[PDB]
Amino acid sequence: PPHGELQYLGQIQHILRCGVRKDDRTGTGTLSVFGMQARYSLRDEFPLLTTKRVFWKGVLEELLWFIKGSTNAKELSSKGVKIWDANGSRDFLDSLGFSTREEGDLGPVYGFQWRHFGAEYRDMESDYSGQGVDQLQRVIDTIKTNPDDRRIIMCAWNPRDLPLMALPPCHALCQFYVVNSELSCQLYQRSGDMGLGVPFNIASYALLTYMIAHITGLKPGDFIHTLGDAHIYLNHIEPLKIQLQREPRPFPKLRILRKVEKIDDFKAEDFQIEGYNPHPTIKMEMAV
Amino acid sequence: PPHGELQYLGQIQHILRCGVRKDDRTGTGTLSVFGMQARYSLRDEFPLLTTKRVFWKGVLEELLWFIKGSTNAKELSSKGVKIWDANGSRDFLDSLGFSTREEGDLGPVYGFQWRHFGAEYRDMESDYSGQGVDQLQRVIDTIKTNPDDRRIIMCAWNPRDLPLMALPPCHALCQFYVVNSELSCQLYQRSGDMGLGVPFNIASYALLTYMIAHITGLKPGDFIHTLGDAHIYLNHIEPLKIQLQREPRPFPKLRILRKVEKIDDFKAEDFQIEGYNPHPTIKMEMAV
Ligand SMILES: CN(Cc1cnc2nc(N)nc(N)c2n1)c1ccc(C(=O)N[C@@H](CCC(=O)O)C(=O)O)cc1
Ligand SMILES: CN(Cc1cnc2nc(N)nc(N)c2n1)c1ccc(C(=O)N[C@@H](CCC(=O)O)C(=O)O)cc1
Ligand SMILES: O=c1ccn([C@H]2C[C@H](O)[C@@H](COP(=O)(O)O)O2)c(=O)[nH]1
Ligand SMILES: O=c1ccn([C@H]2C[C@H](O)[C@@H](COP(=O)(O)O)O2)c(=O)[nH]1
Numbered sequence A, B: 001p002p003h004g005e006l007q008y009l010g011q012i013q014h015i016l017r018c019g020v021r022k023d024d025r026t027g028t029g030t031l032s033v034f035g036m037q038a039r040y041s042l043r044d045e046f047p048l049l050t051t052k053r054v055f056w057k058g059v060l061e062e063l064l065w066f067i068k069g070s071t072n073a074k075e076l077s078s079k080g081v082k083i084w085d086a087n088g089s090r091d092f093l094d095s096l097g098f099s100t101r102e103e104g105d106l107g108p109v110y111g112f113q114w115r116h117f118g119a120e121y122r123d124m125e126s127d128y129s130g131q132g133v134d135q136l137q138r139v140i141d142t143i144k145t146n147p148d149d150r151r152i153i154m155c156a157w158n159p160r161d162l163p164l165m166a167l168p169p170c171h172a173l174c175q176f177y178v179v180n181s182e183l184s185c186q187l188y189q190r191s192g193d194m195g196l197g198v199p200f201n202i203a204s205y206a207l208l209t210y211m212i213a214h215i216t217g218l219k220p221g222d223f224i225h226t227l228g229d230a231h232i233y234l235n236h237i238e239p240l241k242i243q244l245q246r247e248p249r250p251f252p253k254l255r256i257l258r259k260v261e262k263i264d265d266f267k268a269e270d271f272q273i274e275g276y277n278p279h280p281t282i283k284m285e286m287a288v
Helices: A005-018 A055-068 A074-078 A088-097 A109-118 A135-145 A199-218 A235-244 B007-018 B056-068 B073-077 B090-095 B110-116 B136-143 B198-216 B236-243
Strands: A018-023 A031-041 A153-155 A172-180 A183-194 A219-233 A253-256 A271-274 B020-022 B030-041 B153-155 B171-179 B181-192 B219-233 B255-256 B271-274
Touching: A005 A219, A005 A235, A031 A235, A031 B030, A031 B171, A031 B181, A031 B219, A055 A074, A055 A109, A055 A199, A074 B020, A109 A135, A135 A153, A135 A199, A135 A235, A172 B030, A172 B171, A172 B219, A183 A199, A183 B030, A199 A219, A199 A253, A199 B219, A219 A235, A219 B030, A219 B171, B007 B030, B007 B198, B007 B219, B007 B236, B030 B236, B056 B073, B056 B110, B056 B198, B110 B236, B136 B153, B136 B171, B136 B198, B136 B271, B171 B198, B181 B198, B198 B219, B198 B255, B219 B236
Parallel strands: A183 A219, B181 B219
Antiparallel strands: A018 A031, A031 A219, A153 A172, A172 A183, A253 A271, B020 B030, B030 B219, B153 B171, B171 B181, B255 B271
């Protein structure tokens, strides 16, 4: 049965063969399937794709930025990771009616929701200590005290806060699961740019699972990737067909370099990707 | 093309063969798999399971109760549907520390979240008109004005309100999708009692999709059922093996008997299940 990267490549094939033409906001157009699911083992391997190089630096710095609760694009940008900068620009903020908002202030996105769900958002520089639900720490506490729990959820989709966000979250929610000393994670991704977003998104949530497993004394299990609108932008078709011709190399491994006690204490240098031997980057133009 | 019900029966088989032993609060125990997905066509058929009779009256009355925004178990009970009554009882409310709460008051569950997400909950008798986000109406409006939208979400998972609820929602969220004049729906169900809950849950969201398609002038497409902890209670194993001997009968059809303009105007007598030929109920004791 296909395993690891062949799940992702199988999804690409399925959308090319069975996807339906579907317009989008950008006017680019897509081939689209609604509802997919892939399973990536995390057991002695880390699912960083090898058929094209994934932006691992971006994955790791973005995740650390989420964990600290930041909603400031400038703070991620300062680390050489520019993926949120367009959505924090003066022009983009004004386009949403946020003329009074400071440049970089993404509103109550991921970081805020994860650490302060339900608090009143003010700006990206405010102190939210003790405010709202700390979903991330509550996930960790539940795994430690009640691993059988079937409500181990972290949700970024906050209908009250959506109008203030720079972008509605794509990763609406995730759920953790423990059995036989293994930690698994399922992501509900409402919308997946299969060429540009999804490889990165797989790595983010696999990383998060490695982090939480390390904190809780468990072994990584599976990452289950569930998609809503799974789509290939029309201008990614030829690049993806090039990618599909490449034979995958074995996944790398991820090493955590020291014992870390609290999720907030992880730093970028604590992580080491080993044996990563990807084929070259394939240029895929982003839609918006 | 295979009967859609064989997806469900395939899931039962997979859990019996590959599910792992996993304890629960009741001490019943389960066999459990994390992460499953099935697709049920809604095109000229309604996926009301035939290998054991589904409580259709319960499906329909519960859904109408959700749509009106109710959080009062007594109001559902009055229609002959007792499925929430134990969770609203004096005893159960007291067991959660809700000694001051009136009997029947489930707290900010589905109905409240769907129609008033983010409003302040008081009690089951309060007027919430105009308060919070009406997710249900916003879903319907978006389908009508911008069908390509990839953010058509209704979320019941509200971390701020969880501690007031009689039970945390199993149906954490759902997402709608439109292509070629067909409306599809995906449910993220965090926890699935495969014997007792899941058949009912499939029917609820298929129904909701039929309702919203009727309101918006679209044809029903697919229902995609995604599970988190998909589990068989140990005392359902033998009953389910009896069920697995049965060949499915062709699915019924669902007829909507008049033109209805607003989701709030649907009544129970507007719906007719046609050609439903289930095998008999098999007794499966619920875990408490
Ligand atoms: C998670 N994320 C957001 C993302 C992904 N796909 C999208 N696709 C579309 N159509 N629209 C989006 N806003 C979008 N956003 C990402 C992730 C990576 C990069 C990125 O493409 N490239 C690095 C790579 C640099 C390197 O490896 O040397 C960069 O140049 O910013 C962009 C956005
Ligand atoms: C969806 N749902 C809630 C549900 C399902 N499985 C669960 N399973 C567990 N372990 N715990 C729960 N709280 C639970 N809740 C249901 C659905 C049907 C019935 C049920 O008992 N139906 C009828 C059948 C009667 C008829 O056909 O007219 C009844 O006798 O009440 C109960 C709960
Ligand atoms: O982490 C992310 C962020 C965005 N996207 C995608 C999906 C869509 O192509 C686009 C978002 O647009 P909307 O779904 O909100 O229309 O970027 C991803 O795949 N991953
Ligand atoms: O609509 C519903 C409501 C509940 N359950 C199940 C799943 C679990 O077996 C139990 C709820 O318990 P927790 O997952 O919250 O532990 O009832 C369903 O399958 N469907």
